Amino acid sequence: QVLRGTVTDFPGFDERADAETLRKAAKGLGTDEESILTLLTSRSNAQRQEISAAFKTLFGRDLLDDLKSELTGKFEKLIVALAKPSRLYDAYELKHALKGAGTNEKVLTEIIASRTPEELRAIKQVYEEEYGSSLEDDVVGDTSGYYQRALVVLLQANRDPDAGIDEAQVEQDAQALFQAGELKWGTDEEKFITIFGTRSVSHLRKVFDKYATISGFQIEETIDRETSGNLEQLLLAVVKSIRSIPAYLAETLYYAAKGAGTDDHTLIRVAVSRSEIDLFNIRKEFRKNFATSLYSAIKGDTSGDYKKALLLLCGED
Ligand SMILES: [Ca+2]
Numbered sequence: 001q002v003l004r005g006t007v008t009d010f011p012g013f014d015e016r017a018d019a020e021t022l023r024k025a026a027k028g029l030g031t032d033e034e035s036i037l038t039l040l041t042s043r044s045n046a047q048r049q050e051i052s053a054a055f056k057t058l059f060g061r062d063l064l065d066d067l068k069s070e071l072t073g074k075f076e077k078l079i080v081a082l083a084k085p086s087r088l089y090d091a092y093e094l095k096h097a098l099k100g101a102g103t104n105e106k107v108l109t110e111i112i113a114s115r116t117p118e119e120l121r122a123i124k125q126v127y128e129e130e131y132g133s134s135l136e137d138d139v140v141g142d143t144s145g146y147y148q149r150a151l152v153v154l155l156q157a158n159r160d161p162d163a164g165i166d167e168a169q170v171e172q173d174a175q176a177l178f179q180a181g182e183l184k185w186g187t188d189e190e191k192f193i194t195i196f197g198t199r200s201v202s203h204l205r206k207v208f209d210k211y212a213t214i215s216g217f218q219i220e221e222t223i224d225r226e227t228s229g230n231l232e233q234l235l236l237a238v239v240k241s242i243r244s245i246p247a248y249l250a251e252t253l254y255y256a257a258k259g260a261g262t263d264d265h266t267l268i269r270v271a272v273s274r275s276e277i278d279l280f281n282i283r284k285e286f287r288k289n290f291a292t293s294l295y296s297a298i299k300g301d302t303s304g305d306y307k308k309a310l311l312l313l314c315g316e317d
């Protein structure tokens with residue numbers, strides 16, 4: 001609906017003034033992080049880029065390079081994440097999930113399953129113009145099996161638009177998933193992909209509906225029992241993403257800070273990735289689901305300048 005984040009444009013923005021506020025608390029053996037923190041988090045990504053631009057035209061240095069040398073810990077990755085082009089961040093951490101490590105598919109799934117069709121083309125055409133290699137090829141180059149198949153299916157944003165809704169297909173697909181799923185001595189996860197990947201959101205969101213009536217089980221739990229791991233993560237991702245991306249991502253955070261396993265990585269990207277998209281929506285229904293404030297969590301799970309930075313990014317809920 002009306003997706004709104006938290007990070008808005010700073011009143012009477014002064015790119016040159018801020019540009020050298022970072023020159024200062026990046027100075028000598030004084031790395032003043034609370035300065036950078038409050039400022040960097042008080043102005044939209046859009047502007048902190050013309051601050052990065054007014055930085056090297058001013059002092060001839062890379063605001064990124066310099067920053068990422070002076071700060072350490074989760075605070076470093078938080079600020080770097082914060083200071084980079086929005087229309088180049090999703091593609092960024094995608095390259096940092098197909099690199100010298102070669103795992104971190106939790107990033108692949110959560111980015112490719114959550115980004116709407118329109119912005120997939122962005123994240124993917126920009127990737128090959130900044131890195132040179134096909135976004136699809138890099139996925140197909142690491143990911144294998146049905147997962148990589150689904151990823152490719154989702155990676156080319158071709159999902160049918162919201163043209164209408166005909167119960168005819170709704171019941172048609174439902175059973176197609178039903179047979180591919182439950183009614184079989186196996187899994188034709190190829191009816192799954194095409195059903196989760198190609199058909200529209202509206203269609204699918206009501207397909208998931210009557211599947212519950214048809215099967216007694218809801219599309220998601222039938223997945224858990226009919227699929228395993230990574231592939232399951234993707235459909236699981238797509239499914240709940242489809243009924244509500246802010247919800248999916250909202251719980252993407254709960255699971256990121258639960259039991260002695262703070263995945264600062266997800267808490268970082270998920271927070272910055274949509275700091276100005278729908279993070280407001282994220283924390284407002286994070287209360288109706290997880291009965292907790294996203295604010296209570298970040299302060300009661302992390303420390304350092306990290307938490308107060310996250311809090312100011314989180315918003316004011
Ligand atoms: Ca310094």
Ligand SMILES: [Ca+2]
Nearest residue numbers: 181182184186
């Ligand atoms: Ca089966």
Ligand SMILES: [Cl-]
Nearest residue numbers: 092095096131
């Ligand atoms: Cl890079």
Ligand code: NA
Nearest residue numbers: 045081082084
């Ligand atoms: Na950003």
